Design a protein around this ligand. Structure first.
Ligand SMILES: [Ca+2]
Length: 121
């Protein structure tokens, strides 16, 4: 695993600032709640696997050995979301937000609405 600090996440996610109207603090909050800042996090379910900081699934967003019949919307191999370069992770996160919305990560819960200044570095 590779856990980052809150400040490292803040700096690394700069390019997501205000994307879709989501402020930087919200992205950091999303990252904390999604993978605890672990860029190598992998979570398995019966029919799918989620990868990295943004926990992008191999059912619709990326392709891996477990599911080669993935829609591969982000057109990339999931293992790409397990390294130190968040560049492609960010490119794909924007698509998820554009397409499904912030609830891909929040699941209808208001986990990143109050005291947002707490997620600032
Ligand atoms: Ca990456």
């Amino acid at each position: 695993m590779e856990q980052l600090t809150k400040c490292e996440v803040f700096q690394k996610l700069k390019d997501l600032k205000d994307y879709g109207g989501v402020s930087l603090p919200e992205w950091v909050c999303i990252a904390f709640h999604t993978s605890g800042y672990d860029t190598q996090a992998i979570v398995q379910n019966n029919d799918s696997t989620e990868y990295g900081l943004f926990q992008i699934n191999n059912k619709i967003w990326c392709k891996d050995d477990q599911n080669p019949h993935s829609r591969n919307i982000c057109n990339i191999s999931c293992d790409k979301f397990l390294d130190d370069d968040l560049t492609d992770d960010i490119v794909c996160a924007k698509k998820i937000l554009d397409k499904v919305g912030i609830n891909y990560w929040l699941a209808h819960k208001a986990l990143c609405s109050e005291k947002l200044d707490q997620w600032l570095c």
